[PDB]
Amino acid sequence: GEPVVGTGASLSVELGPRLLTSIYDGIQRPLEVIREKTGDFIARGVTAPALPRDKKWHFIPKAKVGDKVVGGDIIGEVPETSIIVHKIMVPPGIEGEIVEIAEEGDYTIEEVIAKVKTPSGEIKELKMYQRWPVRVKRPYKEKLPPEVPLITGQRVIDTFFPQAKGGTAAIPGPFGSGKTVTQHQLAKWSDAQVVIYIGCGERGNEMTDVLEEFPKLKDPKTGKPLMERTVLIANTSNMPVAAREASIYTGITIAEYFRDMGYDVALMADSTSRWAEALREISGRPAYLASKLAEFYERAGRVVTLGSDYRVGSVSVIGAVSPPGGDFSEPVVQNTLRVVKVFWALDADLARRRHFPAINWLTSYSLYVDAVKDWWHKNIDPEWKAMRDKAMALLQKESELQEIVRIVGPDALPERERAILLVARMLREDYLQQDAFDEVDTYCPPEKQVTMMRVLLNFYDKTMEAINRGVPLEEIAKLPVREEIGRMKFERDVSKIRSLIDKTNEQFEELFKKYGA
Numbered sequence: 114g115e116p117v118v119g120t121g122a123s124l125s126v127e128l129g130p131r132l133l134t135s136i137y138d139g140i141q142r143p144l145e146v147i148r149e150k151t152g153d154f155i156a157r158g159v160t161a162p163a164l165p166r167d168k169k170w171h172f173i174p175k176a177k178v179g180d181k182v183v184g185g186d187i188i189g190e191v192p193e194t195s196i197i198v199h200k201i202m203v204p205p206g207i208e209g210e211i212v213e214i215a216e217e218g219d220y221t222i223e224e225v226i227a228k229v230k231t232p233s234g235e236i237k238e239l240k241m242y243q244r245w246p247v248r249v250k251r252p253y254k255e256k257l258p259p260e261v262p263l264i265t266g267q268r269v270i271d272t273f274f275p276q277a278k279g280g281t282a283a284i285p286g287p288f289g290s291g292k293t294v295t296q297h298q299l300a301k302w303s304d305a306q307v308v309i310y311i312g313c314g315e316r317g318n319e320m321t322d323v324l325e326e327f328p329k330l331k332d333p334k335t336g337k338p339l340m341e342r343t344v345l346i347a348n349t350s351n352m353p354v355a356a357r358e359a360s361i362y363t364g365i366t367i368a369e370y371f372r373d374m375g376y377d378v379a380l381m382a383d384s385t386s387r388w389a390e391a392l393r394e395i396s397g398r399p400a401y402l403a404s405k406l407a408e409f410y411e412r413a414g415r416v417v418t419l420g421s422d423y424r425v426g427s428v429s430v431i432g433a434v435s436p437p438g439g440d441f442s443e444p445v446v447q448n449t450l451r452v453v454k455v456f457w458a459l460d461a462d463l464a465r466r467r468h469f470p471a472i473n474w475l476t477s478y479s480l481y482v483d484a485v486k487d488w489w490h491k492n493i494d495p496e497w498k499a500m501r502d503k504a505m506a507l508l509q510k511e512s513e514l515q516e517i518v519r520i521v522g523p524d525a526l527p528e529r530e531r532a533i534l535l536v537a538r539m540l541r542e543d544y545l546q547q548d549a550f551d552e553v554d555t556y557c558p559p560e561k562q563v564t565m566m567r568v569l570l571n572f573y574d575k576t577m578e579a580i581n582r583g584v585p586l587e588e589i590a591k592l593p594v595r596e597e598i599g600r601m602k603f604e605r606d607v608s609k610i611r612s613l614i615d616k617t618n619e620q621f622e623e624l625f626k627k628y629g630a
């Protein structure tokens with residue numbers, strides 16, 4: 114219900130209390146499964162609102178009459194779930210003095226909780242909510258360069274293929290896939306305060322997957338339901354093409370809304386083996402979509418937000434990649450990999466071998482290693498990057514030894530080359546592999562990740578020295594500290610884990626003894 118100029122009608126989203134816990138379609142209608150048809154234009158439809166009008170939200174003022182405010186200043190707070198304090202912000206574009214502000218009380222979002230007098234003297238009435246055109250990226254002061262990692266708790270990601278806050282990552286396959294769980298681990302454990310999940314597609318016709326068993330789903334950081342810090346955006350198959358395409362703009366706009374408050378948010382865009390009909394045209398001009406995609410992904414970022422006070426937020430984006438053929442030379446994957454800075458190569462050969470997080474350490478990548486190393490170094494461990502590089506070099510080396518051995522067998526391999534396989538094997542089993550279903554190992558804090566890495570690297574250093582001093586590998590393979598090393602991931606007390614470093618040294622020292630110089 115508006116004019117023509119460029120891209121369709123108004124085309125907007127409402128941003129305020131009860132986005133959280135809400136399950137929406139691709140254009141922000143509350144959830145019963147429904148339909149919008151279009152092109153680059155607009156829609157018809159039915160009567161459901163977005164944020165509810167009836168609901169009365171407690172509003173705490175955070176400014177007084179006489180305050181100068183700009184686009185994005187926080188004028189009040191609303192507890193909205195037991196996890197998220199919602200921040201009421203002067204919408205972008207508006208600045209002035211506060212002439213009127215509501216009082217500690219309970220109000221429905223339709224109320225006016227403030228009036229601002231702009232410099233030319235116009236009076237603006239501010240609601241608890243605000244409207245925003247999904248296709249326009251919400252403004253901000255500055256986009257900071259990648260530098261703070263999105264800690265995921267999952268060893269292989271955090272060590273070898275870090276995501277940066279405000280970074281962009283891709284991962285195979287549909288999220289609903291039962292072959293792996295890192296997708297869930299990512300959603301549930303990343304230190305983003307707010308999760309915006311765009312759950313594309315669905316299976317069968319009984320109707321009840323991600324819909325039912327999710328208001329029940331527990332948030333392990335707080336014991337409160339994960340819904341209490343999530344916004345769900347449903348893409349069903351019986352929904353219409355245009356609503357699905359709009360859904361990710363809807364999601365990212367909502368995400369930008371939460372970063373604007375000073376929150377870190379993660380946005381997960383699911384995806385399915387489905388042919389988008391680009392190759393329907395013949396004469397009238399394409400790869401123009403590749404750039405629509407790009408433009409999407411570069412709406413991600415950690416930013417200085419609008420406001421008077423210095424404030425930072427981020428939108429890190431994780432996107433599912435599911436080529437029509439399960440191919441992976443399909444344009445969908447090329448197109449994504451040309452934009453994203455991080456690929457987590459989920460791998461069916463790993464899953465079959467029950468190597469879990471089935472993330473291939475050889476074909477994955479992160480362009481954020483350098484950008485985050487300083488954070489690790491300054492906060493957790495000065496040796497961080499050196500250590501990841503050394504482990505990566507050992508896994509790389511193992512790869513080559515494996516190749517060669519496929520051909521000529523293991524029988525001719527020298528002790529030093531066996532030692533390398535022994536230790537790379539520890540590295541694969543004691544570090545890479547993580548048990549997502551263990552109550553301790555489901556999450557691995559930075560401090561524990563680096564200690565564990567020290568223990569393995571120290572073991573490796575000692576192993577090589579031992580071999581070089583003539584100690585049989587078989588005597589190293591049996592070293593009793595190995596059994597402890599293979600269990601360290603289940604240990605909660607980081608300093609007990611650390612103590613394995615002296616245990617190793619001692620056990621190796623005994624071994625040097627036994628084999629006089």
Ligand code: VO4
Pocket residue numbers: 284285286287290291292293459460461464471
């Ligand atoms: O569930 V998978 O992303 O390893 O095909």
Ligand code: VO4
Pocket residue numbers: 285441458459460461473476
């Ligand atoms: O993304 V892969 O399942 O070809 O490692």
